[model samples]
Every structure is written in C-alpha cells, then in structure tokens.
Target: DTLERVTEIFKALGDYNRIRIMELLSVSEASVGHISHQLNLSQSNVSHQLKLLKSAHVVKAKRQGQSMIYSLDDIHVATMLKQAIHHANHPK
Candidate 1:
C-alpha cells in the first residue's frame, strides 16, 4: 500500500509552509527567488522547505545556470496530497 511512502509524504506536509510551497509548485516549477517573493518568505526558508521536499522526493531541482528550479518528482505523492486535501474537505 506504500504505507511508508505515504507516511513520509504526510510527514512532509505536516507544516503549513511546506503545504503552501507544494501547492505553489503544483502549478509549475519555481526558482528560489520566485518562491520567496510570492510567499513573502526568506530565500533561506524557501530553500529549507525545498530541502525537505527534495528529501521526501516531493520535488526535484534542476540547475539552470545561476537559478535553480524545482518541480514535483513523485506523482504518487502528488496524488496523495490531492487525497489529503479531499479528506480534509470531506472527512467521512
């Protein structure tokens, strides 16, 4: 059932900041500056969140010259997030 993977994904989402980061990323990949600017958070904070996302395989980073862009890497995790949101909105 991918229970371990699911657990890791939820654990990563335990933080609201991380959730917001992931939500923003769902639309498209973003550079650290863009994420920080949009979220009104510090670049370091954004990078920290990205690290968590990376470790969890929730995101992957690509080097594009001086800018690094990160995007979702695991469709399973993305689906899990959608399911999580669904559950939050409509718990049985």
Candidate 2:
C-alpha cells in the first residue's frame, strides 16, 4: 500500500504546471486567485492542479475567511521538493 501511495504522489508531481505550483507554495502560502495571478495560469487550471496535489497529500489547504490558503502539506514535502530541485540542478 505504501508503495502504491508513493507512486500516486510521484504521478501527481510529474507535471510542469504542478511543479510550478509547488514552487510557489514552497515560498509562501497562497489562495487560488493569488496562485493564478502569480503563476500566470487560469483560475480554473490552478484549481484543477491544486485538487490533484491535495489528493496526493502533497499540499494542504485552509479556509481564510473568503478564500482558501494553500501550502506544502508539511516539512517532509518541503524537504522532498527541495531535494528534488537540488538534484536536478546538480552538475553531472
């Protein structure tokens, strides 16, 4: 079960748009509207990607009055993302 779950997480992360969203969330929590504007993506598109991230437990959301604020699920997720980025940037 754990392996299957991990696969799902990777699948969710395997997208350019999704990675961009995670990059933004890594810096600061943001609402869908903010993410859309900052990332230059449509609100509907952001919402769809966020839904997948939430399902994979890669990100979490909270209600902040009129809007929903989203951020990386936890420190583990932040670290994992950072490690992946670092590895990608590493010289061969």
Candidate 3:
C-alpha cells in the first residue's frame, strides 16, 4: 500500500524535466508558458510533464481565464524536497 503511493510519486519524478517542474511549482504557481519560459523548455514538453505530475497528485491545476495555474498539491512533498535541497547544499 505504501509502495503504491510512493511509486506513483517516484515514477513521476523519474524524469529530469519533471523534477525541474516540481522545483518551479514549489516556489509558486505558474502557467504552462511561465514554466516553459523559466525552465527554457518547450510549451509542449511542459504540458506533458504537467499531465504526469497531475496524475501522480504532485501538482494541482485550475483554469484561470486562458491559462491553467499549477501548484504543489502536498505540503509534505514540498517540505521534503526543500529539506533535501538544504541538506545537499549544506552537507556536513
């Protein structure tokens, strides 16, 4: 049961692009174009990763006028990622 949920998150994060997308959303909600421009990725590529991330419940999206805004769905995921980065940067 635990593995099922963990696997879903891990699988979605297995890609480099998805990881970048996660980092972006961890900072703030963004539209596909915003993510693409900031990450230097194509809009199509960002859209694809958003789908994968959305399915894994890593990100939540809502239609806002002509654009869809995406943000992290779970605070645990954000905390974990930030802590991991913190440790990596301030390794002892």
Model 3: per-residue Cα lDDT over 5-81, one tens digit each: 99888888788788889899998999999999999999999999899889988889999997789998889889877
Per-prediction CA RMSD (Å): 2.3, 0.6, 1.4
Instruction: Tell me the tens digit of each residue's lDDT in model 2 across 1-92.
Output: 99999999999999999999999999999999999999999999999999999999999999999789999999999999999999999998
Candidate topping lDDT: 2
Query: Pairs clashing in candidate 2?
Result: none
Evaluated against the true structure, the overall lDDT of model 1 is 0.86
Worst window of 10 by summed lDDT in candidate 1? 73-82
Per-residue error for 75 in candidate 1, Å, reads: 1.7
C-alpha lDDT values of all predictions? 0.86, 0.98, 0.88
lDDT (10s digit) by residue, model 1, range 3-60 = 9987987688789998888878887789999999988989999999899889988889
Candidate 2: 10-residue stretch with minimal lDDT: 59-68
Off by over 4 Å in 3: none
The all-Cα superposition gives candidate 1 an RMSD in Å to the true structure of: 2.3
lDDT accuracy of residue 46 in candidate 3: 93
C-alpha TM-scores of all predictions = 0.81, 0.98, 0.89
Q: Give me the runs in candidate 2 sitting further than 4 Å from their true place.
A: none
What is the total number of backbone clashes in candidate 3?
Answer: 0
Cα deviation of 26, candidate 2, in Å: 0.1
